[PDB]
Design a protein around this ligand. Structure first.
Ligand SMILES: [Mg+2]
Lengths: 94, 108, 156, 140, 148, 55, 59
């Protein structure tokens, strides 16, 4: 008898949902974690003019390693020993 | 005094913590059923087979208990005996009979 | 601070009075002396143990089997002292660890019997109307241990 | 007909040998056995998570039964047992409940005593002793 | 699937680790080919590793038949009577060494669903649960709503 | 012998007579059987518990 | 224990009769205890295949 017009969760008329105590307590504990994040972001240490180039050397070395790995791309070596030990297929009792 | 559980059933626990602090010790001897918590065994000695004329007429009377019922009343009797419903005591087809393990595994 | 007796005046649970800690400490000393004397004079038999091993917990007695699902790098026949015994118990007394018992109280010996694979366990995926059908067959390795002895020592 | 297939019967048997125990025409005809064997293997793969979940729910039921025999609820037992630093999981707790009932009475007495100590600590904020079966062992 | 295959309980064969451990392998019957590329790994196995394998665990008797065969095999016989035949067709030396080592380790019971991986033979010590465990008795054993 | 009860190997016939002979040796008088626990006497699946009391 | 095997299994899996009074109780709070002890959920040997049911007599 209790019918909602089609697709109860979308559209103009919907089946209503209500907030439990579970939902309020979960949202409250997440808001407390977020307020602590607001606190611990509030006292920086280096004031944006002292960090101006303090990591330039390590970043340049890291990108030079990336670039050196990228430009060093080439076919692998090829050996006589592999082509010759394919002949071991027809090894009988010697 | 204080005991955390009642100490009349099953067991009598004492909880102890070691002087080091690193292991909990529980001592639990079993409690017996004492003598005055038992009623004596009833001794049924019912004998009404003796009539004075013969003696082995009672041995004749010993096999006087036989009954035949059809499937309906027998199923109703087994159902009211074992407190189940009627659907147990019907048979099954060949298919359900012949796919059942006759040598099942046995643990212990 | 007086409230007359009604239905909700006092809490419904009975008021518990935990004991005095000095007499309780002396009583703990008396009970552990009882249990240590029971160990040292040999008043037990067929004691079991709960053992943490290979990320599980095995309620283990003597002479049984346990089968774990990984190799151990141990040739069969070799004996093993399974550490991390977190409960030992005979009849009439048990000893609990916090979380683990000491290495000197309990000593569980174990022998490896058999190193096998498993029966082939089928892994198959399917999604309808999408032409999606994967299939694997996986046999994980296994090892069989046989718990020889669970001894106990009076160091308590 | 250059190179037409000869070993088709072995592929049919490779699918049908997992369907000998079915019911109906699925145990015989290949066109039906394929779909039912595919659904059977997908059910076998999806059943492992349900097996682990149902086994832990069975252990929760047995531990609730034994603790309610001792007049303890299940959350009180699990919480106040973990507060004494004894880390027994649900499997060995249910196995102790069935096969070692004296050890389970000892554990229920331990959990009830730690519960009572926590209650008296809540009324007193400590002051003095923070109980006895409290005072966790510290590892470094 | 587990409803479609048989199953056994976890068991030892004759209580191995209780007294002395005994090697549960009896035999290894090898059949390799003189000519034929399918038996090349087994040919090298018979060259280099079967002598050290035979010296390693001497409970096992090893036979090498050296027969014309398109697929070489190894037959492993156990103490309880079971016979396990495996094909070493076109395998490495390392794969054949791994195979004969795994055959040497395991015991002759069936590799089927193994069904509750623990075999306590006396599971209870304090006494198994019955509904009159954890129940108090009453004076002269009177039932509820009794008179005398 | 592992995992087997005693009387799965001995297979005695009259245990009560052997028990009263054993108590005749140990100078304990005679065991009287008293009924301890029972659950349903009228049905077809009873359960009884008989304990043997000596003095 | 020591309980020969068939007496032991009989003792473990036996049925128990229980009595529960009515007389000013709500029917739901009687129904909860009756449902638990009819299913056999109050036993640690419980399983839904094991048929570990008990009898409940409500007066
Ligand atoms: Mg609609």
């Amino acid at each position: 008898r209790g019918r909602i017009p089609g697709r109860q969760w979308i559209g103009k008329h919907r089946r209503p949902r209500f907030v439990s105590l579970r939902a309020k307590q979960n949202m409250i504990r997440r808001l407390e974690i977020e307020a602590e994040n607001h606190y611990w972001l509030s006292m920086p240490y280096m004031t944006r003019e002292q960090e101006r180039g303090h990591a330039a050397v390590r970043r340049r070395e890291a990108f030079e390693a990336i670039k050196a790995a990228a430009t060093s791309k080439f076919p692998p070596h090829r050996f006589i020993a592999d082509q010759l030990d394919h002949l071991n297929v027809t090894k009988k009792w010697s | 005094t204080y005991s955390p559980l009642p100490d009349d059933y099953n067991c009598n626990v004492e909880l102890a913590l070691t002087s080091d602090g690193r292991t909990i010790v529980c001592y639990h001897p079993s409690v017996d059923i004492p003598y005055e918590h038992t009623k004596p065994i009833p001794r049924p000695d019912p004998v009404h087979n003796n009539e004075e004329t013969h003696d082995q007429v009672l041995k004749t009377r010993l096999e006087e208990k036989v009954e035949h019922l059809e499937e309906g009343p027998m199923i109703e009797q087994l159902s009211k005996m074992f407190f189940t419903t009627k659907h147990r005591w019907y048979p099954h087809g060949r298919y359900h009979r012949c796919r059942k393990n006759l040598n099942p595994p046995k643990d212990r | 601070g007086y409230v007359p007796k009604t239905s909700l005046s006092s809490p419904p649970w009975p008021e518990v009075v935990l004991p005095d800690p000095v007499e309780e400490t002396r009583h703990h000393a008396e009970v552990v002396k009882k249990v240590n004397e029971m160990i040292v004079t040999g008043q037990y038999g067929r004691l079991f143990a709960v053992v943490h091993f290979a990320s599980r917990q095995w309620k283990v007695t003597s002479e049984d089997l346990i089968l774990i699902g990984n190799e151990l790098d141990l040739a069969c026949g070799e004996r093993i002292r399974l550490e991390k015994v977190l409960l030992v118990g005979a009849d009439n007394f048990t000893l609990l660890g916090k979380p683990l018992l000491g290495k000197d109280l309990v000593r569980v010996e174990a022998t490896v019997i058999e190193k096998t694979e498993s029966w082939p366990r089928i892994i198959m995926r399917f999604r309808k109307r999408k032409n999606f059908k994967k299939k694997r067959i996986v046999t994980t390795p296994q090892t069989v241990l046989r718990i020889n002895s669970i001894e106990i020592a009076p160091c308590l | 007909l250059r190179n037409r297939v000869t070993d088709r019967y072995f592929r049919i048997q490779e699918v049908l040998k997992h369907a000998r125990h079915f019911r109906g025409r699925k145990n015989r005809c290949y066109r039906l056995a394929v779909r039912t064997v595919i659904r059977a293997f997908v059910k076998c793969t999806k059943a492992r998570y349900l097996k682990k979940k149902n086994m832990r729910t069975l252990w929760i039921n047995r531990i609730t039964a034994a603790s309610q025999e001792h007049g303890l609820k299940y959350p009180a037992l699990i919480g106040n047992l973990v507060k004494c630093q004894v880390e027994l999981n649900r499997k060995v707790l249910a196995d102790l409940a069935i096969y070692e009932p004296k050890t389970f009475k000892s554990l229920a007495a331990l959990a009830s005593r730690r519960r009572h100590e926590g209650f008296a600590a809540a009324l007193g904020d400590g002051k003095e002793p923070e109980g006895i079966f409290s005072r966790v062992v510290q590892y470094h | 699937t587990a409803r479609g295959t048989p199953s056994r309980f976890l068991a030892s064969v004759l209580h191995n680790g209780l007294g002395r451990y005994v090697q549960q392998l009896q035999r290894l019957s090898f059949s390799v080919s003189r000519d034929g590329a399918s038996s090349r790994g087994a040919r090298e196995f018979v060259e280099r590793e079967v002598i050290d394998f035979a010296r390693r665990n001497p409970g096992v008797v090893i036979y090498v038949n050296s027969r014309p065969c398109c697929v070489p095999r190894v037959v492993a016989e156990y103490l309880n009577g079971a016979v396990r035949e495996e094909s070493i067709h076109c395998k490495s030396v390392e794969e054949i060494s791994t195979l004969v080592q795994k055959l040497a380790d395991q015991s002759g019971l069936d590799v089927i669903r193994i069904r509750k991986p623990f075999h306590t033979d006396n599971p209870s010590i304090q006494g198994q649960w019955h509904p009159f465990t954890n129940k108090p008795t009453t004076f002269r054993g009177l039932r509820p709503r009794e008179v005398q | 012998m592992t995992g087997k009860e005693l009387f799965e190997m001995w297979k005695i016939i009259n245990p009560m007579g052997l028990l009263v002979e054993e108590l005749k040796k140990r100078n304990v008088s005679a065991p009287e059987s008293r009924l301890t626990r029972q659950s349903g006497g009228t049905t077809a699946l009873p359960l009884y518990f008989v304990g043997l009391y000596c003095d | 224990s020591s309980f020969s095997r068939a007496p032991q299994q009989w003792a473990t899996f036996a049925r128990i009769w229980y009595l529960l009074d009515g007389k000013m109780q709500p029917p739901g709070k009687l129904a909860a205890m009756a449902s638990i002890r009819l299913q056999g959920l109050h036993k640690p040997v419980y399983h839904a295949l094991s048929d570990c049911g008990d009898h409940v007599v409500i007066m």
